[PDB]
Ligand binder design. Structure first.
Ligand SMILES: O=c1[nH]n2cc(-c3n[nH]c(-c4cnc5c(Br)c(=O)[nH]n5c4)c3[N+](=O)[O-])cnc2c1Br
Ligand SMILES: O=c1[nH]n2cc(-c3n[nH]c(-c4cnc5c(Br)c(=O)[nH]n5c4)c3[N+](=O)[O-])cnc2c1Br
Ligand SMILES: [Zn+2]
Ligand SMILES: [Zn+2]
Lengths: 138, 133
């Protein structure tokens, strides 16, 4: 059946501005781009920045919790944390407990996240102190 | 330096309805769930359905092109295509890919082919003003 996430398409108003974001600060190997989109890659992940003229740069106050996270090495956390803080990448939550994570947003207001830890490490941590009404399955 | 997509969190109004969707129709291995969220898996992918009370089930006409795709075997295409076509999963685009949506209006996609196969296809017939690297 389904293998995994094939690609991720993000609607962006300004293409040049948004693609510069992902190309420079996160440094996703920009494969190709054209007049109405761009393809970027990040190892197993495939990112597509499709130009949509109906995408207003929505503030986090006017957006739902839907966000997109990225896997970064634990050692390389502070480095990329400053990378966004020094570049003025805006924040939308502080991430209290739950591990080590830094929440932020892109130019067009797509809520993003930098996280250290896989699902297995999260599930193990929850077995210690679980959430409200948490149930396991395996 | 940072590796691939760590996880994907989706805001959902009704949890019970949403949790059933990904668990039953797709082959998402539901790991855990609680009063305001759930953890599901899809091989290398980690999916989180967070319960948001500010998430209206938005129609596709009132949503941007931002969507999330899934890799499915070419042979197993019709199988999961039938599963959604028979279950009445509403579609929003079609032009090998199958575009549909979740209960809360999150635009989704079923695609066969990786980026390398796509980049090769563009090297044959490229888009308007396409530039490669
Ligand atoms: O009539 C025409 N329509 N048209 C559209 C495009 C186009 N622009 N961006 C994308 C595109 C590419 N890749 C992706 C991905 Br991957 C994704 O998720 N969205 N997406 C859009 C496409 N497309 O072929 O789908 C080019 N030529 C034409 C002609 Br000629
Ligand atoms: O006072 C309290 N507030 N509170 C919130 C939660 C909670 N609800 N959803 C998530 C959640 C989990 N995992 C994830 C992921 Br993975 C993700 O992307 N979002 N996300 C949210 C959490 N959380 O553990 O952060 C639990 N306990 C409490 C207490 Br006690
Ligand atoms: Zn797509
Ligand atoms: Zn998160």
């Amino acid at each position: 059946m389904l293998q995994g996430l094939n690609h991720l398409t993000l609607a962006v108003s300004d293409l040049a501005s948004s693609l510069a974001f992902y190309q420079q600060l996160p440094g996703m190997r920009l494969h190709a781009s054209w007049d109405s989109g761009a393809y970027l890659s990040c190892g197993a992940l495939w990112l597509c920045l499709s130009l949509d003229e109906q995408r207003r740069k929505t503030p986090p106050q006017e957006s739902d919790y839907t966000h997109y996270a990225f896997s970064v090495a634990e050692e390389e956390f502070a480095g990329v944390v400053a990378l966004l803080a020094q570049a003025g990448a805006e924040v939308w939550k502080d991430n209290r407990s739950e591990g080590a994570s830094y929440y932020f947003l892109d130019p067009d207001g797509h809520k993003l996240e930098l996280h250290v830890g896989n699902l297995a490490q999260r599930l193990a941590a929850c077995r210690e102190r679980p959430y409200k009404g948490m149930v396991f399955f395996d």
